[PDB]
Design an enzyme around this catalytic site. Structure first.
Site, mmCIF file in Angstrom:
data_model
loop_
_atom_site.group_PDB
_atom_site.id
_atom_site.type_symbol
_atom_site.label_atom_id
_atom_site.label_comp_id
_atom_site.label_asym_id
_atom_site.label_seq_id
_atom_site.Cartn_x
_atom_site.Cartn_y
_atom_site.Cartn_z
ATOM 1 N N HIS A 124 -4.483 14.907 -9.978
ATOM 2 C CA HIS A 124 -4.526 13.715 -9.212
ATOM 3 C C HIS A 124 -5.459 13.858 -8.056
ATOM 4 O O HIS A 124 -5.618 12.658 -7.376
ATOM 5 C CB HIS A 124 -3.045 13.530 -8.699
ATOM 6 C CG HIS A 124 -2.973 14.258 -7.514
ATOM 7 N ND1 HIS A 124 -2.218 15.635 -7.604
ATOM 8 C CD2 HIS A 124 -2.626 13.985 -6.147
ATOM 9 C CE1 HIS A 124 -2.156 15.776 -6.398
ATOM 10 N NE2 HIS A 124 -2.532 14.964 -5.557
ATOM 11 N N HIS A 176 -6.842 18.711 0.527
ATOM 12 C CA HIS A 176 -7.040 18.217 -0.817
ATOM 13 C C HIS A 176 -7.791 19.212 -1.497
ATOM 14 O O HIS A 176 -8.850 18.806 -1.872
ATOM 15 C CB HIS A 176 -7.560 16.971 -0.850
ATOM 16 C CG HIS A 176 -6.795 15.800 -0.400
ATOM 17 N ND1 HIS A 176 -7.119 15.277 0.859
ATOM 18 C CD2 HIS A 176 -5.663 15.101 -0.874
ATOM 19 C CE1 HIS A 176 -6.089 14.277 1.047
ATOM 20 N NE2 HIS A 176 -5.341 14.302 0.023
ATOM 21 N N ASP A 232 3.541 14.086 -4.419
ATOM 22 C CA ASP A 232 2.234 13.945 -3.593
ATOM 23 C C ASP A 232 2.551 13.741 -2.090
ATOM 24 O O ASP A 232 1.824 14.403 -1.332
ATOM 25 C CB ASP A 232 1.368 12.626 -4.130
ATOM 26 C CG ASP A 232 -0.087 12.856 -3.440
ATOM 27 O OD1 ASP A 232 -0.481 13.803 -3.252
ATOM 28 O OD2 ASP A 232 -0.507 11.467 -3.215
ATOM 29 N N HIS A 292 -2.859 22.370 -2.612
ATOM 30 C CA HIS A 292 -2.214 21.050 -2.657
ATOM 31 C C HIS A 292 -1.930 20.631 -4.016
ATOM 32 O O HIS A 292 -0.747 20.218 -4.520
ATOM 33 C CB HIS A 292 -3.001 19.956 -2.055
ATOM 34 C CG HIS A 292 -2.519 18.702 -2.363
ATOM 35 N ND1 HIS A 292 -1.248 18.498 -1.756
ATOM 36 C CD2 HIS A 292 -3.053 17.687 -3.063
ATOM 37 C CE1 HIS A 292 -1.304 16.875 -2.120
ATOM 38 N NE2 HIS A 292 -2.061 16.478 -2.900
ATOM 39 N N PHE A 306 4.799 8.955 10.532
ATOM 40 C CA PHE A 306 4.735 8.904 9.032
ATOM 41 C C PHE A 306 5.951 9.226 8.200
ATOM 42 O O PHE A 306 5.832 8.607 7.127
ATOM 43 C CB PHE A 306 3.781 10.152 8.555
ATOM 44 C CG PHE A 306 3.483 10.445 7.187
ATOM 45 C CD1 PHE A 306 2.971 9.228 6.589
ATOM 46 C CD2 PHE A 306 3.624 11.643 6.641
ATOM 47 C CE1 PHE A 306 2.636 9.613 4.991
ATOM 48 C CE2 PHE A 306 3.274 12.070 5.591
ATOM 49 C CZ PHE A 306 3.019 10.814 4.462
HETATM 50 C C1 LIG Z 1 0.994 16.881 6.172
HETATM 51 C C2 LIG Z 1 1.806 15.949 5.659
HETATM 52 N N1 LIG Z 1 1.152 14.586 5.263
HETATM 53 N N2 LIG Z 1 0.864 13.759 6.534
HETATM 54 C C3 LIG Z 1 0.053 12.607 6.595
HETATM 55 C C4 LIG Z 1 -0.316 11.808 7.628
HETATM 56 C C5 LIG Z 1 -1.271 12.317 8.636
HETATM 57 C C6 LIG Z 1 -1.431 11.489 9.960
HETATM 58 C C7 LIG Z 1 -0.583 10.320 10.251
HETATM 59 C C8 LIG Z 1 0.373 9.889 9.115
HETATM 60 C C9 LIG Z 1 0.643 10.513 7.951
HETATM 61 C C10 LIG Z 1 -0.431 12.273 5.211
HETATM 62 C C11 LIG Z 1 -1.219 10.947 5.214
HETATM 63 C C12 LIG Z 1 -2.384 10.610 6.035
HETATM 64 O O1 LIG Z 1 -0.713 10.018 4.423
HETATM 65 C C13 LIG Z 1 -0.227 13.134 4.131
HETATM 66 N N3 LIG Z 1 -0.749 12.880 2.911
HETATM 67 C C14 LIG Z 1 -1.612 12.064 2.463
HETATM 68 C C15 LIG Z 1 -1.357 11.203 1.197
HETATM 69 C C16 LIG Z 1 -2.196 10.343 0.605
HETATM 70 C C17 LIG Z 1 -3.399 10.225 1.216
HETATM 71 C C18 LIG Z 1 -4.577 9.406 0.932
HETATM 72 O O2 LIG Z 1 -5.523 9.208 1.596
HETATM 73 O O3 LIG Z 1 -4.501 8.811 -0.313
HETATM 74 C C19 LIG Z 1 -3.564 10.933 2.366
HETATM 75 C C20 LIG Z 1 -2.734 11.773 2.824
HETATM 76 C C21 LIG Z 1 0.538 14.467 4.422
HETATM 77 O O4 LIG Z 1 0.935 15.039 3.390
HETATM 78 MG MG LIG Z 2 -4.757 11.627 -3.755
HETATM 79 ZN ZN LIG Z 3 -2.394 14.544 -3.123
#
Ligand SMILES: CCn1nc(-c2ccccc2)c(C(C)=O)c(Nc2ccc(C(=O)O)cc2)c1=O
Ligand SMILES: [Mg+2]
Ligand SMILES: [Zn+2]
Length: 322
Positions: free
Chosen positions: A114, A74, A229, A78, A283
């Site tokens: 964001h 973040h 996102d 990104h 995911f």
């Molecule tokens: C690289 C790709 N990736 N992988 C995961 C992912 C990772 C591990 C397990 C399960 C999912 C996540 C996740 C954890 O959601 C990704 N993006 C997110 C979006 C929104 C938030 C939030 O806290 O609001 C966090 C992360 C992501 O870009």
């Molecule tokens: Mg966010």
């Molecule tokens: Zn984001």
């Protein structure tokens, strides 16, 4: 000669799978700034909203400064990525001329902020640790609320207000839109957002897509920025794996503190029960594919290429398992 090669890469600003990391480095860690500037130029927004160029750069630079160089995911890169993704998303043939200029600006801008000032740990983490932020926002969309507050407050620095020449009505309307969008990036609103997206694909109409009321338009936009996102398993593999390495580096750091405080270590925050690959497949099977599959239906068949790659990527991560 290094602005030449950066100019060269920026010609890809309309393509999905833009080399955004190369852009990061090739600009002196100013990816969000160069990338926002190129988009506004390309879309003529400076002219349309009479944004003085002096003002535009200052603002993006200060915004970009408020991304934390020391959080792996973040960060400004990104931010740069979502921005550029939303931009391409905006251009899909199936949305041609559905959105006003002011609707367009909100979605790009909101994308730009964001996650500004993201600390590198999740909402739930911040709620669990009775944090100063979580106390502020009563455990509700803690970070999103924050990114918005910071994104808006910066417009107040000297020569930063890129909205100065909008009308009052224009400012109200854009404020609301940016708020409605950034708030929709809260991962607990996912299921409900998506369920709404599903009804809209269910009862959609064409001419190109048709929407005649704020609430249908803002929904599409919210989901568009949610997609952007959550768009990285849909990029070419070399890009997506770098994003994985990164978010994973960020989570492991969270769990190092989660295990340190002594809470129960989050799921997939444990570098000792890392199931990185297993966790991308999951995911994708439960969050990302369902989502994109749906958006691809709204804009059939524009997102076909994005959905293919998504499925090539998943089929690859699976290959890494047993
Ligand atoms: C690289 C790709 N990736 N992988 C995961 C992912 C990772 C591990 C397990 C399960 C999912 C996540 C996740 C954890 O959601 C990704 N993006 C997110 C979006 C929104 C938030 C939030 O806290 O609001 C966090 C992360 C992501 O870009
Ligand atoms: Mg966010
Ligand atoms: Zn984001």
């Amino acid at each position: 000669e290094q602005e030449d090669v950066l100019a060269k890469e920026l010609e890809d600003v309309n393509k999905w799978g833009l080399h955004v990391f190369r852009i990061a480095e090739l600009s002196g860690n100013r990816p969000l700034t160069v990338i926002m500037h190129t988009i506004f130029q390309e879309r003529d927004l400076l002219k349309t909203f009479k944004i003085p160029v002096d003002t535009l750069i200052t603002y993006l630079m200060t915004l970009e400064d408020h991304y934390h160089a020391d959080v792996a995911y973040h960060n400004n890169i990104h931010a740069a990525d979502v921005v550029q993704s939303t931009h391409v998303l905006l251009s899909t043939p199936a949305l041609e001329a559905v959105f006003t200029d002011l609707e367009i600006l909100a979605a790009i801008f909101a994308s730009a902020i964001h996650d500004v000032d993201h600390p590198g740990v999740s909402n739930q983490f911040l709620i669990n640790t009775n944090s100063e932020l979580a106390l502020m926002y009563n455990d509700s969309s803690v970070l999103e609320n924050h990114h918005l507050a910071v994104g808006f407050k910066l417009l107040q620095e000297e020569n930063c207000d890129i909205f100065q020449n909008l009308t009052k009505k224009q400012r109200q309307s854009l404020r609301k839109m940016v708020i409605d969008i950034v708030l929709a990036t809260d991962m607990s609103k996912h299921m409900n957002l998506l369920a709404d997206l599903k009804t809209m694909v269910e009862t959609k109409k064409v001419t190109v897509l048709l929407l005649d009321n704020y609430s249908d338009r803002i929904q599409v936009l919210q989901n568009m920025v949610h997609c952007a996102d959550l768009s990285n398993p849909t990029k070419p593999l070399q890009l997506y794996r770098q994003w994985t390495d990164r978010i994973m580096e960020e989570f492991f750091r969270q769990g190092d503190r989660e295990r340190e405080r002594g809470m129960e270590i989050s799921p997939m925050c444990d570098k000792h029960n890392a199931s990185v690959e297993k966790s991308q497949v999951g995911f994708i099977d439960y969050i990302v594919h369902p989502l994109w599959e749906t958006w691809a239906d709204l804009v059939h068949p524009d997102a076909q290429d994005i959905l293919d790659t998504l499925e090539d990527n998943r089929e690859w991560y699976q290959s890494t398992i047993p």
